[PDB]
Each structure stands twice: as C-alpha cells, then as structure tokens.
Symmetry: D3
Subunit: 267 residues, 6 copies
C-alpha cells in the first residue's frame, strides 16, 4: 500500500537530475534508505538540530535538502561532535536524507529561474556552463530602473531586514540598470561570467570584501542579499511535490520545514 | 638630508617585526624601494584606485598598508587588468608599498589590543599561538552584560550602520556575557580556540553561514562587525608614526589615507 | 553505575593510546564513554554477528582490535553493509573503543603472549615505534628443527592448517634457534627480523612474492594466518576481570563468542 | 638458427602485448630477441633455482608470467638477491619475455583454462580492460553445493589445502550454480563478480578483511592460492610445441621444472 | 589616425598564430596594451637593460620579442631585483611587449625554415609534431659532404667565432652527411625524433654534456652553434614587417634591435 | 692474499665520506661488489663505451667514477639501449663501479680546492652550505689582475682550445678582479651565493644563456671553462691512491683512465 520513498525521488529526479549537479558536488541519498514505504516528506534548506527535532516531532520519513549534511567524509562517529549528534538522531528515527544542491540552481525552472521570475529578469541564459546547454546562475534584462530602485526591490521581494549594496559612490545609486545577473548561494566566482555577458549588476550571496572590490574595479555593481534568499527552495519544492501528490493521487504528506536555521540576525 | 624610507620602516619594525607575521603571510616591502630619501608616508587599509589617486595628489612616496596589493604571484603585466593598472600607476609615480598584515594583529599593543581597550576586554591572552608567547586574536573578561547590550556596544564603538548577530533564539539576546574573544578580519578558523579558552562570545569578520551554524552547535554566540572595523589600523598607525615624527624630529609628513575602499553599503 | 570511561582509564594505563603506531586508529570511534554502563564485550573484529551478539547480550561497550572505521566514511547509506553495522551500533547505543597496534607493542601485549606460548625468551622488538618500544618480537628458543617448530605452532594455536615457507625438503631439518614473530600483518618487518638474527619469522598474511624474497634472503617463515590474534579476546577479558575483582567493579565482562574468521580449510 | 623474435611473433599473434592491463609489465625486459636461439623455457616466476635450471639446460629465452623487473631498478649491487638473478641472466645471455595479465585476458587464456577445468560455461569477463575483453571470468555450472565445488577445486588443481570463505555450517550445503574466477590476485574484482550474479568467487590472495566484506555482500569464496597458475607453464609449452611441429621449427621447448612455490602446508 | 598596435599584431598573427605555440609556452602580449595608436615597433631576441635603453632612445611603443621577459610568475615588484627594474622602465616609458617564442619555430616559413634555406636543407618536415600537420624542428637532405665541411659551412653561414662539434673520433670529421636535422634554441630533447627520421647530424643549441654523449651512443653526430644563431629572428621579422609596412601603406616605423644581449664571448 | 676492494674504499671514504654528498645525490657502490680480492683500480670521470673497453683491456676490477653510470632508476634491461650495453659489459667482466660525485666537490682538499690551488685563489671558503661547516664551490682572493688576464690564465692552466668569457662590454676586459668564485661541474645555481660573498668573477661550467644574462645584470662577470676541467679528478684521485699504495704497502695497480669521453670539440 504505502508509497516507496524511491518513487517520490524518481519523480524529483525527472525534473532535476542528480547528474546536473556540478562536478565534485554532493547529490542524492546521503543517509538512510529509499526502499521502504513512507508517509511523510519534508523540504528543508539545511539540517540543523532544530530541523531534526521538527522532523522527529512531525513524523517525517524523508527530508529533501539543498545543503548536504555530509559535506566531507566523516572521520569518526563520536557522539560528542555536534554534527555527529545530528546523524545519530536521523539514524535512530529512520529519517532518510536526500540532497539537491547545485543541480536545482542549474536546472531549467529551478531556483535561479524563480529568482528571475520574482524580479522580472527576462530573456535569461545561464552564467557558467556546467554541461551541454546548461549552467549555473542566470543573466537577463529588466525594465530599466536605477541601482537604488533595484536594491529596494530586492530587499522587499526577498523580505530582508538587511541588504548589502556593493558600490563606492553615491552617484552609482542613480546609474540605470537594465541587465542583471543572479546566482543563489555562493556565486561570487561566477562574476567575470556575469561581466562578460553584459551585467550592469550581479546579485549573489557571501561576497568577500576583496572580491567586492574586484567587481567594482571591473565596473560591476553588486547586491549581496545573504545566503537566506535560498529558503525559496523550501516553499517551491514543497509546492511542486504537492502538485504531484494531487495530480498523481499520492498517499503522502508534504511539508516545508518551518524551523529557521538562519544564524545571522541584523543590528 | 632627506630621511630614508628604510629608517621609518626600521622604527616601525622595532615595534612590529616582520617575523611576527603568520607563516605564508605577505610582509614587508612589495613594490618599489626604501633606499631613497622621502617626504611623505601614507597609512592605508587597502590600495584601490582611489587610494592611488589620493597618494598621487598628496605627493606620497611610501604607503604602509595592511592588505597586500601583491597577494598572489603576478602572471603578466597586461594593462587591461585592473590590478595591474594599480601596479602601473604606483610604479610610474614612484610610490613604494610596505605590508603589515597579521603581524599587527599579533603584536602586543597592536590592532586586537586596541579593540580590547575600546571594548573594555581585560586580562587578555591570544587565541592561537603563532610563536614564543604570542599569537593572533585576544580573549578576556568584560564587566558582565547581556548579548544584546554587547552587540549595541560593538555597533556604536565602531560606528557601524549594521552588525550581524549570531544566535538562533530571541532569548540569546538576554544571555549574560562576561568572557569575550575578538579577532580583526578573517578569524573564523580560530573559533575552536575561543571556545576552548572559555568565550561566551566571539567577535570576528567574514563569518560564513555554515561556520556560524557550527559555532552555535558548540554553544558559542558571535558578532560579525564586517571587515571595516580594521580602519582603526589607519588611525592608530598614522598617530603612532606622527608621534614618533614629532618626538624624534623626523623630516617627514605622516598622513592617514582617507579615500574609502569599503565596497559595502547597507540597505 | 560506573562510567565506561573508568574502564578505559584502567585499559589506557596498561595500554596507552600513544603506544599505537603513527596514523593508526586508536581509542573511541563510535558513541560515548561518559554514561554509566553495565556490560563490556571484548572482540577481535566487529561484523554482523558481533553486532547481533552485543545486542542480545546487552552490551554497552565493545573493546575491539580492528577498527570498524578504518578510513573516512563517505555517506551513511543503509544499503552499504559497513554502514548497517554502524547503524545498528548507534541505534542500540553501543560504543566502540579501538586498541589496534598498541596492544601489539606494550609489554605483556599480543606479541609477548605469543612468545610465552612458544618459549621465545630474552626478546626485543622488530621495528622501533617509540622510546625502547616497538612492534613485533625477536628472541631465542631451545634449538629445534624447522619441522618441530611448525608442529608446535600448529598445535599451540589449534590450527586446521599452517603455511610453512621454504622451497626444499632439507629445510625441514634445519636447526632453528632464533625466532621472530609479529601477529597480524607484519611481512614488512621481515628485513628487521633478518637484520636481528632470525632463522624463522612467524607472521600473518605473507604475499606470495614477499615469501620468495624472504627465502632469497635465507629467512624461513611460518604463516599461521590472522586468527591467532583471537588470543586478544580471552586475554583482555581476563585482565578486565582481574580489575573488576581488584577494584570492586559491577560490570559484566564478555569475551565475544561470535566467530568472525572467514577462512575454513579444505 | 631461428631468431628468438620469430617465436615471439607467434606468441604475440595469440596473446598480444596490448591485451595486457594498463601499466602492467609486458614483453621483453632483459636481453634481446634478434639473435638465433636453440631453447625456450616457460616459467611462472624467475627465482634462483629457475636461473640455475636455465643455465644447466642451455636456455636462450624464458617466457615468464610474473615480471622479474616489477618496478624500476635503483642500483646494480651484487649483494641484492634480485640483482644476483639479473646478473646471472645477463652473464649467460638469457633473455626474459613477460606475459602477465594478457594471457589472463585472451580467449583460451589462463582463466578460460580454469573454466574448462571446472565446467564453467557460457562465460564472460569480470572487469573490462578492452573492446569486448577483460580480466577474470564468470559463467554457469551444473548446480552443486558449496562443499561439492570446494572438493572439486581442491581435487582438479591437486592442492594440499584450499581456503573456503564462509562463516556458517549450512553455507556448505548452499546450492551453487554461477561461479566467478580470476587466477592470481583478483580480490579487487569481487564487486564485479557480485554485480554479474556470482554465488562463489574463486581467486588467490584474499585478505582477511576483504573476505569478510565479500561475505557481508553474500558472496562465498574459494582461495586456492597463487600456485594454480602453474597451469601456464604446461599450457604455453604445449602451444609452442604445437607451433614447432606445424612450422618446422628447430627449437627445444622446456617447461620449467624448478618449483618456485614458497608455501607448503602443515 | 595612428595605427593601432593591435593591427600590427593581427597582421603578424595571420602569418604566425599564437595558438601554434607549444603548450605551456609564453605567447602574445605580456606587458602593456595594444589598444592605443603607436609610431614604432622594435624586433628583439631578448629584452635586457641595453634593449630597454635602446627602445627608450628610439621612441619605441611596442617590442616584438622571442624570449619572454615574464617567463615565470612575478613574486613581487621590488626595485632591487634587476628583472623588475626592466619591467619598471618599460612601464614608465609605455613600451608594450609581445612574445613570439616557439610558434615562430614551428610555423611554415619560420625560423627553422630560414635555417634550412640558409644551409640548403631540402624536402623538409618537422621533428616533433605539435599539431595538425605541424611541429618544431626540421629534418631534410643536403647535397652530400663530410662532417667537417658541414661544420665549416655552419660556422660561416652564421658568423660564429666558435661552434661546438659533437663527435669522439677524429675520423667522424670525414663521415659523409646527407641528412640533417636542425632546431633553433634549446632542442636537445628532440634528438630521438631526429635519429628516428634518419638524421646523420643534429644541429641544435644548449646541448648538455651528458645528452651529447647519449646522441653519440646512438651514433648521431651534432653541431652546437650556441643560442645566438636565433638573431636571424630579428633581421627576418623586421624585414617581414617593413615589407608589409611598405606594401600596405602602414603609418609606422619598424626597427631591428641592435643592442647585443649575447652574454658569451669566446676566448 | 689479495687486497679486498672494500679496503681501498675504506681508505677513500676516510678522506671523502659518502655522506658529504649533497642530498639526493648518487654515491658509493652502484654496480658489483667490493667483497672480493682485487688487482686493479681505475679512476675515470664518466663511464662510456670507450671507458668500458679500456677497463676490460687493462684488466680493471673496480672503477672509481665522478659521474654516476646509474643516474636514475633503470626501467628495464633491454640490450638494445646503449646505456644498458654499458651495464651488461661491466657485469659480464665483473667490473665494480663506485661513485664519488658531489662529495669530492665539497670535501676539504677536494676538486674545488685543486682549482683554487691551480689558479692561486687564497683564503677560501665554500659557496653554499651543504652540511655543518662544509659546502660546495669555493670563493677566495687573488693577486689583482684584469678580467682578460684571468681569462688567459684559466684557458692555459686548464688546457683549453676554448674559453667562454661572460660579459657584455669591451671595457669589462680591463676591470680589475681580486675576488674569485669557482665551482666545478654545473654550479650556475650557486651564483647568487658567489655574488653575496663578494665575487668579482664566477667560474663554472654549463652556464645557460639566460642565467649568464642574469649574472651580468647582477654585476657579476663569469668564465665558462666547460665541463671537462673536471678531468683533474682522474690524475688527482689516481695520484692520491698511489701515494697510499706506496705508504701502506698495497698490492694493487692504480690507473687513471686515458679514454677521453669529451663529446665536444671546438671549431
């Protein structure tokens, strides 16, 4: 009777292949099995302590996650290491964990496309090729507006108590922007690609001080919205999975993780 | 009898030896010569285009800098590379460039000590040993106060228009803090040292999303004041050298750089 | 209830973690030692039937010779047999402590037991691993022929078979008076055996080609396999038992009974 | 007198140098093939008593399975036993040609002989090494129990002992119908055996820990040792003999009689 | 309407593509820019101090050079390094520097072809393939003569005050040669190629003592004319560019460098 | 009765320890044994074909050689490789080969000291440290003479049909020299050491074109006498061994190799 976890993942991978992930990237099942019948699937950005308690509490069998819980090989299983207590808790409660990291950023109609839609960036192509006719990040054109207006829009659309604008002068704020590059997560190394493709502005998280200076030297303005604009992953993958439940008659519950894992609170 | 640039540097180095730099770190003279007589020394955090223009306009011969302009080996001298254009303009106007990077962070009465003085952190020692009874970072005790008060004190003491607080739970805000670690610039890899030495809070710049989560798993709160709290370098080292100049009867002018090379403007 | 770490303090004062060879697994690898415990199993290996035995017997701590984590773990996929062992241990809160090469090295450790068992006297070590300590042993015996020693090794260790390393018939009659030994996989110490006067070298897991090279050097050899190191189970259990008695411990101490020998002859 | 290279042309048309696995020793390693010759020895290994035999018998060329130069030579010091073998060959103008993994791979090569010997039918390879070719074999047998197969392997190869890999009594009664085999040191191919439906994997030189991992995967195993590859000597000599007859060669062909097996049981 | 330096280089490159350089070899522009209009191009073998002085005195804007002045990455720009002082003086007088190193050796009607023409080596092909029907070095047939005569011809044809003959035995001198390999500069690692293609003699520079013994063990005679036979580069490329200049009506002067940078004076 | 080869080597190593050789260098016995009684020892620079025939012809049991016959590990023993035919010939005739390479250059009263004596270079120390209070090359002072006079002296003292002087100008020829660095063999990489130690002139073999240019940029003149000035090794080690024969009553013949192995014959 119960839906195998593996038939949920079969559906996910048809939209978003494992092999669309950049080389060297974590992908796919990392913890547990998919061979068994399940009732509940959660979508999360990260798995921290609060995410584990929440999965236990809500009776979750599988978590589909963007950032891998095993990001490097595990040296030992000492219960005194906090990362190991997470693994121990998942294993004890038979919570399987499946990773969709850079492949969701690359795929057509994936996270970076969501970004483009929410901001009205159009006629998009990707930033850096990762495979035949695909790549990470996006660049496209907007209805012209100034740098400051783009900044106000980003802060609002993404719900930010905090936006970092990257510029030196006050007159940059009135520079018209009509071509915008965007890359969720840590995309600062795709900036020369955004520059070669004609970006007026690059939006990406985790922009190092020195690289921000380099961009500015290249004549490229920037917006750093932080790494948390990626929570869109949660509502969007939950919403897609639920559309599948309804269309295909699935007997599962689909839940977005509510436990915030954002470590950074401004001012 | 113009003062040799080497004699300024000799004075600087008796205070802050090149050898106190962390291994592999840039140090000392990078561009030009210190064997000619000079008129003016500028102190800077970075050398960007505006620093170069400012130095040219003010007739500077030597710049004392914290962040090295030659930070990796140079592949070519193509003018079309913004970094080379900085090099080009320094060489043409005979501006010598001297680096004091981690040694100022490590030295007694250096940058991390100035921070401790400004925040009232007493009975200090270092976080990571880098040599005979010395190292990078500082940890000590404050007059007790809550996490939020410390964060407010940090925001004001450093003239920040935003500071990142690292916590998850609203009630972290009310947590009594009495032991504090601090490390100018990119100090997140010393957080275990802070934790081992009994810090309730770690103040450091450029804290990655995932490291912040790890700190919190370890039960360590943090404050990320961004990279620019290290402009204290400019003010303190210009004053240190102006005082030497006055006391010792030096025939040079010592100027603090005031072209901002901060790429980050909040909201 | 005594903490598991109070058993390990007693173990580590006999057999320090540091006496392990450089880069070798040592100490606690899975679980914790700061909870009260009731039962400790001594095992040579942890395989599926060691896990099942530890579960059925109510084991809190397993002290083991061969590490269950012998290299970094890449994922925690249930479909990998090695992860299934980890999974079961974690779920049953079974901690696992490793004593691999240190027990080999220490005085009255694994290789000293073999010596006592075979009458190897006035011993020293093969390769140096620390101040006046090292892996393997070499000393002297009452002279016997190669064939007499081989009968004795097969008998003393209860072996269905033994591999003798030699090419010729008259090697069997060669008088043997100095003997080297290293439990487990010590073929790489054979040049030290030879340098220190060994007529015969007894060790496990001798490659075809290495055996030939030993013989080319004039060194005869005996390969009893790896299983002679189960001595570890009975001997470490008797040590813990002795400590229980002396110190008034209330733990039960269990030598593992689940055979993890994969090799059966003929 | 026929050139040694005219024997090797015939060998290489059966068993090409290229069919060797990547990075493996192959072909001529010592001497030359462009002088007339009278005698060719087939050997498995070259050790001191193979050298002495080649000298006494007037051998010009040795075709061997295991390379005598298996890594670069650092010096030519007479006091190293391996150099003494080189020294004697060079002084007696004995050339040495290597056929290591290629003879394993080729059709009617080493692993096909084992199949014919054991009744393994409708075979394919374990790991791919080239276009429709690879190392090891897997195919089907008339179903028998694990214990029946083990008796047959011990008997068919004339073994003083055989290592069976299993933990439990009732493994002996397990019906076996699909069998993998790789002469020599093919434990690293065992995942391919398992992937392709093997109930049992027969190979040499199975490490203690690998054996346990095989068993964890449900794969039973038999370790007959390395010496079952002496089949190479008799079989390649009969091939050369057949060519001598067909082509009117005047060379004598000698299977080496000097046993270089280092391992004798009990 | 001054001619863009890039237009000279485009003309040069249609003849001798950068891509014909051996992999890892320096190529193309190394110092400065080619986007400004210029007056004068100098051709040189090397750029040493005298080349720099000569270029400054003659008002040169672009130097086309065979041996790269940036031949490994630059660790610093310290004036006390003679190599940096060359860089410094080029940058200050705005002399751009363009490298044609192995591509001129490989290209048809390039340096090794000019040598063959001068020595009468016919029916040529290359020694080592470096791409689609092309490579470095040349081998062909001469009108037969003895080894000593060839050596005398080489000494004169190239205006050498010494040449090294590679042989052991007085009677090698009388050996009939009819097949000859040649490779400008450091070509001793192509000698097996020469031997395989049937050379009686190999002409190449910078032949190590031990390699020469190896050639001779293989029964290959050699001639070492030293590095300076590659000044032909200067003369031939200056003439090539002056002819283009005249035919195409270019508004630039093309000068051969005549400051000798040969460090080697015999007896 | 017959002297063991190993007692000859015991005497050699007491003058010239194996362990005085630079790290990574070949040293000591490479081919054969020293355990047997011998009649004849030859001293050679190199072992080539002609050196082998000569050793066979003269009935030599041991060769003491400066340049190692096994200079890297041997991949196979194909008799078709010329270097392998040398080994095959040595082995068949039981000729043992012993190497004394960089240790003879380092030791007190070794090859570089012979050079100093023959040229009257005095108050010598070594160039580069290789061990406690020892190193390779020498530098000392001469009775002042011009560069040209030093060159004429070197050519004569060493019997050269060929000396390469390293300078750019004709007035360098009259520059007074009073401090001279020397290193037999390939010592061009010890030149900065010669420069830091006050050399006016550096004498060494196998000086690459580009390095000669570098020296000249450093203000260091040079003389390249080729790699064959090292034959002094032959007469000097033969002369020392024979002095030992006579003093210690040895029953051996001592011969210097006469077979020239010089591959390079000038003009």
């Amino acid at each position: 009777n119960a839906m195998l976890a593996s038939e949920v993942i079969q559906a996910y991978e048809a939209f978003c292949p494992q092999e669309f992930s950049m080389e060297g990237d974590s992908r796919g099942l990392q913890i547990g099995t998919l061979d068994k019948g399940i009732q509940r699937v959660m979508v999360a950005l990260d798995i921290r302590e609060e995410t584990v308690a929440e999965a236990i509490e809500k009776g979750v069998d599988l978590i589909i996650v963007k950032h891998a819980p095993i990001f490097r090989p595990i040296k030992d299983l000492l219960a005194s290491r906090p990362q190991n207590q997470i693994y121990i808790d998942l294993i004890k409660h038979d919570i399987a964990v499946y990773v969709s990291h850079t492949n969701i950023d690359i795929v057509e109609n994936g996270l970076n496309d969501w970004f483009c839609q929410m901001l009205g960036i159009e006629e998009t192509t990707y930033l850096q090729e990762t495979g035949p006719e695909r790549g990470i990040g996006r660049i496209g054109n907007i209805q012209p507006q100034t740098f400051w207006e783009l900044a106000q829009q980003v802060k609002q659309v993404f719900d930010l108590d905090s936006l970092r604008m990257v510029h030196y002068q006050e007159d940059d704020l009135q520079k018209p922007i009509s071509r915008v590059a965007i890359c969720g997560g840590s995309g600062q190394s795709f900036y020369k690609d955004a520059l070669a493709k004609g970006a007026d502005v690059y939006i990406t998280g985790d922009i190092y001080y020195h690289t921000a200076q380099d961009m500015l030297s290249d004549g490229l303005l920037a917006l750093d919205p932080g790494h948390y604009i990626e929570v869109i992953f949660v509502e969007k993958i939950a919403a897609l999975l639920s559309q599948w439940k309804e269309d295909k008659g699935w007997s599962i519950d689909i839940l977005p993780s509510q436990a915030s894992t954002n470590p950074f609170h401004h001012i």
